[model samples]
Target: MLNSLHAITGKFKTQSRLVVGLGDESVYETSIRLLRNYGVPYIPGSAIKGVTRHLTYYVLAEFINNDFYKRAKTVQDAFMKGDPKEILSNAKVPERCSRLCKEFLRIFGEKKVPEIIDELIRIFGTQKKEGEVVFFDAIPIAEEIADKPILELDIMNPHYGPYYQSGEKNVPPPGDWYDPIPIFFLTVPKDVPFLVAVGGRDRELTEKAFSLVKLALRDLGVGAKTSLGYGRLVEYV
Candidate 1:
């Protein structure tokens, strides 16, 4: 199964707890990769696939503007729920594709459509079928880069009303606001070379999927606080 596979590499530039989890762990207030022996941390390959999946969905959304994706103005998860058949059914085929883009239309066929969707699904895998792509955990190249991951202090506060307002957990009426709460967490540092890999049987499909994985790492990013520029990857160009 490992024969005739492909692998890709890149660097994850983390500016700062790429915070995950819902603040329930026994240690630290925010989230970090807590499975290892000590301070060393790594980005789970599963997380990488997750972000890449969203990016792939984004790509499909662009091509699928024929129907299901056009109304939303842009593709978002709320409007992206569908199986491969559904997506292909709604995807645009351009009547006849150019030589450079003909393969994209292969999914429009009755037999090819189902087979193609299966390939795409396996890129990320699900309970019903296995994924063709394998994402390896990203690790730092230098010992200095991997040395003693640290936690920084942070906070979050809801500026309007208490969470409960009026309930068994709240006061008689909703208050004006809630107090600020301090949140201590770990954040990834910048300019660390993180090795990335994606392997599968179908060379063409994996290569196509891998391209978006790089883009997702660069633009979408993984982990929490991505909006604040936390998990971007600049593939060591």
Candidate 2:
């Protein structure tokens, strides 16, 4: 009955071990995001949306900062309408954002700040508003992983734990005397292909969301320990 939805799908192979929900409560020192019933490791859609949203903010910051007042005024006038309460009331008028977006695009063209801000809002809505895009959980391809173990033990050895835990009042400076603590956790091994998908009612909007997510996963990675090269993925096809 609801067959009109459009979805963009892609496959990505892990370039490095991927781990999600590392800080989740577990019997072990660290944990991974695993299915409750099947115990299969999967990346949550909320996490994907969060990372993509963060990347968009980074790009928007640069674009706005480069031409400060001009773009700033444009966004301000469109959303604020010269009054703070215009977009914040418990009313349905806020949904008119799309209407304003069309007008801005016609005035500013497709290459300006209006397009960026509009797509950002439309794809990922605010606290009270609902977004048009839907991020699906990234699950490993079953046939590809049928012959091997999907999860494996990984270690995070942090040295100088006591020095970090101690307050400045009685600071124990990091030295050779401090013992290293190695915390073992579970992670998805590299080269595993995961099916990633994002859906929306509008085809163009869904494509934009998918592109942002791909860039985020490739550059920023995901989960914990991204600094150490964890969660990096490369598009397969």
Candidate 3:
């Protein structure tokens, strides 16, 4: 009954506090989401798909923008018979490339929504369309060391941070100094392991799915407040 699962396993550690929001309008609305099922605060696999898709779209968008007809071919090849890894090497997706990404997004659309751009979703389903890949919720390894993660109080002291130029949420009255509103959160310390697994019908899908997760964790970070460099996962041994 054991040793029958076909999959790849790995781990990543948070570099800073990671926030996965759970509330809507509560004061704790801004609080870091602590989700538990097996009695642990863990990162959900669906959320994992999002960060992975963000990176995949960026890379694929960048790769296809190299030339004129080349962009068209890139889209066709990927949706038709392209190697998934071919899009992995792209370096950047720029602001000017939205039009380019849209073209490919037509093929990579998730679920019934025919206009969304999520290439990893196209592969991993991004948790859509009877998903081909799976991301297990990552739990803190601190359980082995301290039996629980060190829960602490963290704040989004936006005044000390950058104020958004124009936004309903963060924009305050001119010369209005923001308050020290805090959101008590839980986080895993460094060197703690969060396990990840990817699987599918074939080794190629599993390997490609694994690549998306690895690249996304390192490059994009996860959870929330990624702008401040939170939720980053380092390369694992």
TM-scores for the candidates:
0.58, 0.62, 0.54
For model 2 the TM-score comes to 0.62
Cα lDDT computed for each candidate against the true fold: 0.55, 0.61, 0.53
Could you say which candidate leads in TM-score? 2
Ranking by TM-score: 2, 1, 3
Best by lDDT: 2
RMSD after CA superposition, every candidate: 9.1, 10.8, 10.5
lDDT of 1 by residue, 55-110 (tens): 54554554454353342233333223444554356555345444323433432334
Q: After TM-score superposition, what is the CA distance of residue 155 in candidate 2 from its true location, in Å?
A: 8.4
Global CA lDDT computed for model 1? 0.55
| The 10-residue segment with the lowest total lDDT in model 2 | 84-93
* Model 2: number of backbone collisions: 0
Model 2 residue 110 distance off true place after TM-score fit, in angstroms = 3.7
Give lDDT tens digits, candidate 2, residues 1-237: 765779799998888988754344464322333432124366778888877765544333233322433443433443324321332222121233433234323433445444455566678775445689998878767656544655666676543432112234232354444257656556777887788989999998888788778887887787667768899887985
Cα TM-score of candidate 3: 0.54
lDDT of 3: 0.53
